[model samples]
Target: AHSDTAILFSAESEWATRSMKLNHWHDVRDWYRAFLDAGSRADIVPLAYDWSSYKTVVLPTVLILSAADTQRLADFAAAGGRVVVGYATGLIDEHFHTWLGGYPGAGDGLLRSMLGVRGEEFNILGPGEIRLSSADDSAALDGTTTRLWQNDVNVTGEHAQVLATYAGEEADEWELDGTAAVTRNPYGSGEAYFVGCDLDVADLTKLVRAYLAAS
Candidate 1:
């Protein structure tokens, strides 16, 4: 019965830098908790779970992804699947070699190309928060504050829709002003979403549930 959604957990990826301030383990836990808080149902799968088997998949900061796994995700999205990717995914590989050309990996990689958004600028707000503005009147995102982290998101694809834009902070010190804080883009038949900030549990749950509910 529970075949629609999945949350992938990677032990090696977590062990890579679990002690760091920005950890994949932490993001995974956050997503799990957020899903539970939202009263949503999803299975926690492994790194090599069937990629295209589910309608929706959550990759919570999968920093060190294998080439095969990356290709599977690309195929999944291309075959009418929704992918909810957390921050800093596919940044490094097994040898810890950084993925060049773009944030999600290579500039021409399939997963990165499917995402249709990239970040050249990153911000570590450290205990600070910044406000966001959006044209959508949905309660979850009408006025929300992003805490701790942000990416100066650049929407590169024409199919992308900017759900929210960074509006607070002086002189664009954060390098986030008037930029997309969250984005959704159509892949092949399904779509992909990028959460470029550290939103609290309440807002995150709302937004993610919104995603789950959307077409």
Candidate 2:
């Protein structure tokens, strides 16, 4: 399955089958299907698979991850591979302890440094609660909206680009209002993108096409 992009399709393994937190299984399916809808060729690879041949790797809601896998992705991005990370990734270890510092929740500072963002908390939206994300010129997807999940994501890297922001939601005039929801970071020879929420089909399609075009 040689393709330009590799989607980290999760079986979450026996640990989480062994469950904890939001699995975000729907987001994984959304990304794969979005790629298909966008006419972008991708392989649904497992968490343990190698990413050497692909130009881009998409990790959608892979909650639990090992330190080795986390470092591997960091190296992949440094080697000029595009890493697209989705919500609640690497938030815990195989034993399922929440990554202490923040969301992304693993790899010490590796994951956060690579993506140039940190998620403080997750906004688990109830019924009818939606957060609209307005994209900048660099984001390539303007007027995109999302719901169900939103993180208090903040930009921390020097070379990070703010791709999109949460344009205040009615649910609560909270801290994440107008905060960064999506970001792109220049890590060594490559770039890494972080998405802090669950996007709907149309928005996900735009995202898949955006990365596909990068290749």
Candidate 1 stretches with Cα past 4 Å from truth are 106-108, 121-215
Q: Give Cα distance to truth, residue 131, candidate 2, Å.
A: 59
Candidate 2, run of 10 with poorest lDDT? 13-22
Model 1, span 65-161: residue lDDT tens: 7665776776677777888877767777766777766667732365677788877633346625777676456655756777655664568755578
TM-score of predicted structure 2: 0.54
Which portions of model 2 miss their true places by more than 4 Å?
A: 13-21, 127-215
Alpha-carbon deviation at 153 in model 1, angstroms:
32
What pairs collide in candidate 1?
none
Q: Write the per-residue lDDT of candidate 2 for residues 182-208, one digit (tens) a residue.
A: 778765667788888788888888777
- Model 1: what TM-score? 0.54
**lDDT of residue 88 for candidate 2:** 64
Clashes of each: 0, 1
